[PDB]
Amino acid sequence: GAQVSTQKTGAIHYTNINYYKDAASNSANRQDFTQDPSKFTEPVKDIMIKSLPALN
Amino acid sequence: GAQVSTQKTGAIHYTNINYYKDAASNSANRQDFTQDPSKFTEPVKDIMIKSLPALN
Amino acid sequence: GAQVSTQKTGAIHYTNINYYKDAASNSANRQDFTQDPSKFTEPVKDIMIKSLPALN
Amino acid sequence: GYSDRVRSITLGNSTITTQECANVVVGYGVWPDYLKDSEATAEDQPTQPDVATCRFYTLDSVQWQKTSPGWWWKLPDALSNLGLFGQNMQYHYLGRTGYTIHVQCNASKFHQGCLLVVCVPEAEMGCATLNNTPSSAELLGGDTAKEFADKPVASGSNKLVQRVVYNAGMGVGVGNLTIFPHQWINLRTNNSATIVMPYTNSVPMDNMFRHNNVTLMVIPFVPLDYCPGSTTYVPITVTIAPMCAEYNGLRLAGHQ
Amino acid sequence: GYSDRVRSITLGNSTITTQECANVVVGYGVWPDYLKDSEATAEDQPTQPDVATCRFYTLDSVQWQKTSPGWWWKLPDALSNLGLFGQNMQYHYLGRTGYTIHVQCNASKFHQGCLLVVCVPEAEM
Amino acid sequence: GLPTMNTPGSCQFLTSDDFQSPSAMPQYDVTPEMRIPGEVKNLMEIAEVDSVVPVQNVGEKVNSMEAYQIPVRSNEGSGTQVFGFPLQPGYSSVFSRTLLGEILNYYTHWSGSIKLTFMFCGSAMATGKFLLAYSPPGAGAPTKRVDAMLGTHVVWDVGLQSSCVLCIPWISQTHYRYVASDEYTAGGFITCWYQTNIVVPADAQSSCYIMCFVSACNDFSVRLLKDTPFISQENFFQ
Amino acid sequence: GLPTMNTPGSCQFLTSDDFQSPSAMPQYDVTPEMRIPGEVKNLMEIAEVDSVVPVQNVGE
Amino acid sequence: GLPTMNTPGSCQFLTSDDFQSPSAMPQYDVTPEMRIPGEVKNLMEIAEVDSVVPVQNVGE
Amino acid sequence: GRVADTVGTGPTNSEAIPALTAAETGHTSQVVPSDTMQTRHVKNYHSRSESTIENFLCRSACVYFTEYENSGAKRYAEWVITPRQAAQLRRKLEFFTYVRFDLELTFVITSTQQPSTTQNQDAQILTHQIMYVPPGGPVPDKVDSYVWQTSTNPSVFWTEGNAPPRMSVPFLSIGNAYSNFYDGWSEFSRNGVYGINTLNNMGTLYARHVNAGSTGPIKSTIRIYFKPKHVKAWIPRPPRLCQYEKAKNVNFQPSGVTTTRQSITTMTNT
Amino acid sequence: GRVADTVGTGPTNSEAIPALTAAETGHTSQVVPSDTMQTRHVKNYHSRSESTIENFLCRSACVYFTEYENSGAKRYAEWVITPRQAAQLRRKLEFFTYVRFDLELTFVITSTQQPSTTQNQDAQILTHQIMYVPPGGPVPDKVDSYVWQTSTNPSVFWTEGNAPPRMSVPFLSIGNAYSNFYDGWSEFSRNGVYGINTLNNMGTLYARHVNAGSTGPIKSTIRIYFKPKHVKAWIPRPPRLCQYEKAKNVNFQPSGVTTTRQSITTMTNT
Amino acid sequence: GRVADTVGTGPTNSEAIPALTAAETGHTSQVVPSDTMQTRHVKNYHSRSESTIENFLCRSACVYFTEYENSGAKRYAEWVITP
């Protein structure tokens, strides 16, 4: 019951398998890249447009 | 002749194989959850109903 | 997710697998034979022919 | 026709209208709300006072002077003596709330100044001496603003809190506080500022008297500077509205 | 939302933003441009420095007093000591150019005054 | 018994390695997740948040609020320099303790575009202009406005709107730059020059102040995690 | 010889670990199960049974 | 525990060997390649280039 | 995951003003360098990978160590589990108000002879035991006390010369996450202990020699290493400034904002 | 990959002249031995494999070593990372102007007793620590300094008797490749340090004992070994002639072109 | 395996009496907290796993130990097997 994924390159596959019955035994997940800056920058109710003056 | 099952999580699969010829060599079974309280609570011949008085 | 290739003989296959998540962990590539001498020998703009005199 | 300078907020009975302001910073982007039943713990049915609770309150206005270091309030216990939200606080073991903070300081066009309104979840203040800890009387006061102190506090055997502004009492750089939600009251282009804080905490509900989870801070960066003959006394006023309150585990009256 | 009081001009590296101004008077109505090949004379291929040249410069600011009569500059030789446009001026026998002039004088609401910015082709004193 | 050969690197403990280990408390039960506002999935979302810059480090003022304030005063002549500081976001004392400064010190390499946000806190009536210049290295910090012109500059004006944005572009002969001080990759310079002297009415205060901000654009990136020299220790805390 | 690298945690004895071990008495024969009344599959079925409470602890 | 037997040659360090090792800096980011003139893929392309011969070694 | 592209731009004359905004809204302008100048089309292959939380918090770190001997007064070492007794780890966790993750423990044990006049000292291989005691459990007051039988409590037997031992632990907190900062008391009267010290009860960790191992005295050293995994975070905050003082509370000694330099114009640090 | 075939040829009389060319064009003639003589058809199975770059640069090599002791003045060893402090490796990399590759480090550590009069010396298994410090990081001035906690910096704990430790490192350079030769200064004034010394800042490498390990003094020896992989190269050049002198610069002592022999006709070396 | 859900309930007035029973039958009442008070619908994700017998009895434990020497009276150790 193996699995296949991609390494980290720049300019391939590796085979990993979980050997234990406890989630905390699985290897770290280094690859989660999801990012949404909107939760710190732009925390306003009225959406503001770049191309327009801020206070009209 | 492998086998696949599920880990213990909260909010995946692991591959196990038995390498020996004796049952007592197999790993422990941690996952059997079957439960039937009726063998200690409610040990009566006449089934009693919650919504009704006990002694009528 | 294995892979198969050929050994180095003269007058066969080996099974390799990448176990790590980082490209720099993969084994060396010994087998790349590509060669193009034209980048040192023959570095001229006008292509010269062997069978003819050099300066005509 | 429209304008971005003007805003009108209505909760329950009270209403706050401002003709000069900026937009309303909302939390981290989560508009406050009730508790979904997926995360619930308490099995008693929660009370939802709604209009009895949700509305605007106005604490004591505090003077603002050229040398004034700043101020801090603790939200979970400020209101405790005001309104039903003060009553419904004492009779329950649990509460869940989120805050709309509205700060009002106005001045004419001839008054220089800049303020910083930040709302800091779980601000934990140190102690004067290194060994002790602050007393419950020093970190808090009913409806009254506690103020900082511009120069270091001499360390005796007392329990006094460390009031230096540039460390902001938490021992961090004051210049960095803007990661938390904030707005800038600026006597030039602004009048009032506004914040909306959703419920932030490690556990889905909390006791109100034990754990003060949200701290409000107003720190002037550029002091008040004005030529003579203009009016001297410029107060700052704070307005604090709970939102979507809930309560559980009715018990007897008191805290002890 | 928009405003006619505000303008932002960007050429090359430099940028000039002004929150109080009027529209931009354009020439006689001919937006500046390169040279079409119908009118050309020089048969050498022209250099077009583009960003190296096109950008904003700021000369010496001059005080303005109650009695101050006025001022004049000569554009073809003003910049001659500034930037590559000063260098690319000395190494060539020919040049073709057009100018965007931007004059900045601000005052509070309590200051009376009026100025006249004209751009006079071939003023012969 | 499947034949096998240990390889160099067995029975070693590496700090950064990735491996699986047997759990010490089997079938432990994990409490369910909760939905907490403000979930960070990446540090880059911190690096885009504004922060104040202690632009004035002079003397002993670093112990007061005045470290964050930039004096601006009406002069009798134009072209005086408002301030200037080198760009070395992980080294230079200016950015050192800033928000962006902290996150960098953990990382050796970086690239991107640093925004500088300025905001004029002066009196509502007083107006003014300013010249924000950026001079790439190769010559000393320009000492006269005429020299600052030849850089990349944004002439910025006070008015109804307040905040300004000077976006420092990314100009270097390499892809990344050392966060630690080195003369090879040295960043550049920044200056602010009076464009037109501050004009103030009567009865309005002469001197104003200007606060600065720092943030990283969406092209920002870092690399090669390390230790931060700032935090000290002696013996274990008690 | 398949190349291999030991990892930290080899040759340790953990108290709670899960592993397979070779049997010491091969092909031993196990006596069959019996059906015994009152089979517990889980401790929670004990926790639901009533018990008296020494509510009065006073004195001796 | 899959049974296994070490073979002679374990725990040795060979100079020319080929093996995989765990990376010391996970998920490091590599700068992209550039196209540089004169890329050597093999040394034989050096061996075909002319060179002068010190044919006269006599004396000093 | 990849950096965004910088899109090219020609000249501009227009009434739209990217370069202006108002920071009073608490809104960081999104302006990109193509707005205030001319820009060439450029593809960026840089990646943000190594900046993710996982790679940031996950490195082994030495939180603490003790000394226990083979004879005399102190025959075992006891430690309560807090991350905050080590400077450089504690700081890395103070960015985030609420953290969630699964510890991975690794111990490193070493032995050292001690000066003595004992004759004919001949070593034997020592064996270290490491026992974890969840809160409220029995507490051994002596090395031979019955508690060391470990009928339940997870325990590890280790031997010198082998690889360092390792075990992984799942998420142990009661609530929905660990809490680094906690404002409040433990008592409804707002009295007693203040600060995060109240939330933290992790139990206790013990170690001892199994056997005397030789005639001569021997002192041992144990070291703990955390390696967080599967991390999640919430509510970032400013890094700490002033040097730490105590492990139970945030108390600090007032210190300046930054280092200093000469007059504002000066372009070099001092 | 294979050698080319030598194609047969009979006699020749013709005006095409393979045997003549002009080297002034900087053009190496492609003439093959079949042109200037008669040749038989021959198949060659020889292979060029072992001449590829990969097999040429990839071998482990000892760049450097130090000595640090268990007591006294020097309790730890510090080294900045440059390949150029070892002769025979540095030369193998001076063929190529621009090199690109991924290091694979391997350490070999050994221990040695030192002469002393201390009585009843009884050894215990030593434990070595090896810490890497990327540039600008904190620098430990003493063995017990806090920096050794390694909250971040990659570190390796090792034990005697086990296999030699190994770790792989990816490509660390800023630019698109390492640079062996660099002509220029570090300062825009053409002053200061000249040569490749300016480009090279790799950080620093440290090592120490974890535990004293015995009563008697012990000196240790550590050795580093590079093993380049995934190599790419550009712009080959002449091998170095004169013996090396300094590790920071190309400075050399003038020496003859070759060895000598007797009069030109003489067919044997002297 | 999972905990049961606590089902919500409004007010009640009725002759059915959950809150009463007779323990003399040796019968533990099954009453759930929704019966004697008002209750909100709540999903529980708690699991009973770690309470199973297997995880309860399975941990290594030190039953006993002896001492035997290399010379002298006692050269070996003998023990009968009882837990």
Ligand SMILES: CCCCCCCCCCCCCCCC(=O)O
């Ligand atoms: C031999 C078994 C050893 C088990 C090690 C258990 C260690 C527990 C670690 C708790 C982690 C970090 C928590 C800080 C706690 C708090 O302040 O709330």
Ligand SMILES: CCCCCCCCCCCCCCCC(=O)O
């Ligand atoms: C324990 C971690 C050890 C990490 C070892 C890092 C060694 C870096 C090697 C750099 C390689 C060769 C580079 C020459 C540099 C230059 O001159 O530009």
